[PDB]
């Protein structure tokens, strides 16, 4: 799947390439800006916007990118300036786009990307002195806006969830025409596009540790692979079975696992359509 | 899952830390006050209050702590540990529910603020009279819920899942209401006390291990309490009560006169 | 500009001089009483009272006094000076606002008159019980006003004028209401406490000078508080809050991608 993170919001990757690489603030400057203004809505049990759904996933994706980044530094700073060049640059553009579309409006940021493009394409002998400005003058749960918890997702066994290869094959076989659509179509589609993109960022970083500096691939499939297996399984199943069905299946299969085998139905529950 | 024993009753642990540890009457003095005033209601087939429910589980939890304490003294250094750690938290819980039954709940919350003002005062300006509250037993744990100990006595010991598996089912399904400042049911009140009763029972057992026969005497009793209140929240009370009737007919029937599959609780 | 900390709350300094200096509970005893009773309201995005506002600035001022006191002990003679002079005035301010939240404001003013009658009595006719009040934590200073510490963290250290220049702007524009016996706004209440907090901070610094790193740790924090409340009185709160948004976009933009002039707060 070639999924654009900006396509459902009316932008593309090449449209945000109009701003230079050093236009964007640091991740600390942007994560402080989100918590200064949207910390009560980014931790709300509501969707509230597609921009809030896409911002919650990018905040959790950077934490998993930085969990792997410090772990390689303990178990081999050459790893961390590669993250700031490749993965952290994509995080900074994605954080900047959603924070400023919340602050200023999505049409305003799309008008501004065009206006800054005309300004930066001007040669410096004819460029105006003032650039265009956009001025109008935190622990997140990935499942909370969908009615679940990390506690309810871990209520099921660790080895219950299918492989990350089988889930990306399922999303490609069933939702490739909608995950690559320029529409939102659901909050499940928004949270699933970011999960597919974030797994590509970690799989880019994990093979870079493997080629340059192979114990890291076992670690990412234990901690970050299990978290992406539950995240892919949750949103795929809520698309094909419904969100209320998957929430009741989590407490049906969970109590069935806890029940002694002599006093439960003999076969495991399953979701079927 | 961190449960406050007083959050549904308008207080906190930090509000009852205003009173000192030696303020509270002994367990024997508090159980006599309960027996003399509230015995036909604490042995009643009614709920009668959320205070009556929380007091019933607290009297029954002290009996399991004393049964565990009198055993490990046969197999007095431990009784100085029970009275300092587990007997003190029972004494705060027994005092709180007797006093909110005798004086009302808003009187005890107001008395907690007033005793805090008295205890924070330096002694040159603190009056000699401390504030006082003046202006106004065999318990079955299941009897207020329609069941009995004898009705649940037919379920074998391997029917129930682990205490860990029952504390995960409570936390994955009901944590939002077990840590709520509401009551929400008498099944939630009884479930809050049983989780804290297991926490007092476990810290005694890990301390005397520095032995796990508690998993056939006290852990079995906790497992039926944890099973009964989880199931009555999941399936409903009348569904669980009529399942316990039909399971008992099955388990009293000898083999070759019953179907080889036990009844299943669902739907 | 001489500000009475209790004039908007119906009292004076001379009325709280009826109580002796050793009457008041310790700072640790008073902060636990605030934490146990008023923490979801003292960490709330609401005002909820003028007493809640004055209590928030007093808890945050004691933290800056203790940060200044624990530094100069590394570079215990000063802690006997803080507890005698600055810790005593905090203890009167912490006691007054906790007690007017717990018992009401008219009860505390009546208790101050009654304790004065008791303390003036000669000891042969003074009763043994002193009068008592019986009948009924990480704070953000800007959170009740719509801002945060992180929102004001983008303004550089040279944005703000001097503490002297900010105390003259308050005195030349708002002295008639900062010395009034009214509240007039939550911005006036917070401004009264910050001017008195700087006075307690400065007398400690001139005493330990008989060193001015307070102008990059504590004077910087006072300068943002003095700037924010003066500007929200001058320009309005929503004008200042949307200026802080637009200034942050400007200061996060690197040079050669922003206009070379910062946004100006006016109109």
Numbering used by the authors:
A (entry chain B): 1 to 76, 195 to 255, 285 to 360, 372 to 431
B (entry chain A), C (entry chain A): 1 to 75, 195 to 255, 285 to 358, 375 to 431
Reproduce the article's own wording on this structure.
Freshly purified VLPs were used for cryoEM data collection, and structures were determined for both T = 4 (at 2.9-Å resolution) and T = 3* (at 3.6-Å resolution) configurations. As such, this configuration was termed T = 3* rather than T = 3, and 5-fold (C5) symmetry was imposed during image processing rather than icosahedral symmetry (I1), which was imposed for the T = 4 VLP. The T = 3* reconstruction was less well resolved than the T = 4 reconstruction, likely because 5-fold symmetry was imposed during refinement to account for the unique symmetrical arrangement of T = 3* particles. Both the T = 3* and T = 4 reconstructions had clearly resolved density for residues corresponding to the helices of both HBcAg molecules within the tandem VelcroVax sequence. Unsurprisingly, given the presence of flexible linking sequences, the SUMO-Affimer, the second MIR, and the internal Gly-Ser-linker lacked clearly defined density. The fact that each fused dimer could occupy one of two orientations, leading to four unique arrangements per asymmetric unit for the T = 4 particle, also likely contributed to the poorly defined density of these regions. Although the majority of the VLP was well resolved, density for the SUMO-Affimer was not evident in reconstructions of either T = 4 or T = 3* VelcroVax VLPs. For both T = 4 and T = 3* VLPs, maps low-pass filtered to 10 Å revealed additional density above the four-helix bundles consistent with the expected size of the Affimer, confirming that Affimers were likely present but were not resolved to high resolution. In an attempt to resolve Affimer density, data for the T = 4 configuration of VelcroVax was subjected to symmetry expansion and focused 3D classification, using a mask to isolate the region above the four-helix bundle. However, while there was considerable variation between classes, none of the classes contained well-resolved Affimer density, confirming the high level of variability in Affimer positioning. Focused classification yielded no improvement in Affimer density, and particles were distributed relatively evenly between focused classes, suggesting a high level of variability and flexibility in this region, as expected.
We have developed a modified HBV core (HBcAg) VLP, termed VelcroVax, with surface expression of a SUMO-Affimer. The genetic fusion of these monomers using a sequence encoding a Gly-Ser linker ensures that the genetically fused pairs will dimerize within the assembled VLP, termed tandem HBcAg (tHBcAg). The genetic fusion of two monomers results in a tandem HBcAg construct and the introduction of an anti-SUMO Affimer into the first MIR of this tandem construct forms the basis of our VLP capture system, VelcroVax. In common with the wild-type HBcAg protein, the modified VelcroVax protein assembles as both T = 3 or T = 4 particles, composed of 90 or 120 core protein dimers, respectively.
